[PDB]
Structure 1
Amino acid sequence: GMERGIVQYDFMAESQDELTIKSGDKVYILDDKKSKDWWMCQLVDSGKSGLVPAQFIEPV
């Protein structure tokens, strides 16, 4: 869990490389270096991973 975050808005994946997340969900931030718009994250509880809007992720 090198870097953690908390989801701030619901987001539903519309394509394969995205990750559906719900407000309040805890994530690992896997990659916040490649894009200021899209971060690769993984849900702590389910282990599901993919791209989400950066602006929806509050780092801990």
Structure 2
Amino acid sequence: GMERGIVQYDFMAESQDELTIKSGDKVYILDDKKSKDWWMCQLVDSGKSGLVPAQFIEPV
């Protein structure tokens, strides 16, 4: 089912749609087609989801 990624650099959500992430975190990439710039991700460990800037995520 799930496309995976690894977070490269810390990012703090500034808007309610965004997801705060830490360098090294594992995510699921829920969508990367609506925008090359904003990907919807879900943290494996917490289950929280939101948008992150795409350059913060390295697909696995």
Same fold (TM over 0.5): yes
Q: C-alpha displacement at 1:46, in angstroms?
A: 0.2
Q: Which residue of 2 aligns with 1:54?
A: 54
Q: C-alpha displacement at 1:33, in angstroms?
A: 0.5
Q: What SS class does the counterpart of residue 15 from structure 1 fall into?
A: coil
Give, in whole Å, the separation in 2 of the partners of 1:22 and 1:53: 13
Percent pairwise identity: 100
What are structure 1's unaligned runs of at least 5 residues? none
Q: C-alpha displacement at 1:15, in angstroms?
A: 0.4
Q: C-alpha displacement at 1:2, in angstroms?
A: 1.6
Q: Which residue of 2 aligns with 1:36?
A: 36
Give, in whole Å, the separation in 1 of the partners of 2:38 and 2:55: 8
What are structure 2's unaligned runs of at least 5 residues? none
Give, in whole Å, the separation in 2 of the partners of 1:19 and 1:12: 7
Structure 1 stretches (4+) deviating beyond 3 angstroms?
A: none
RMSD: 0.7
Aligned residues: 60
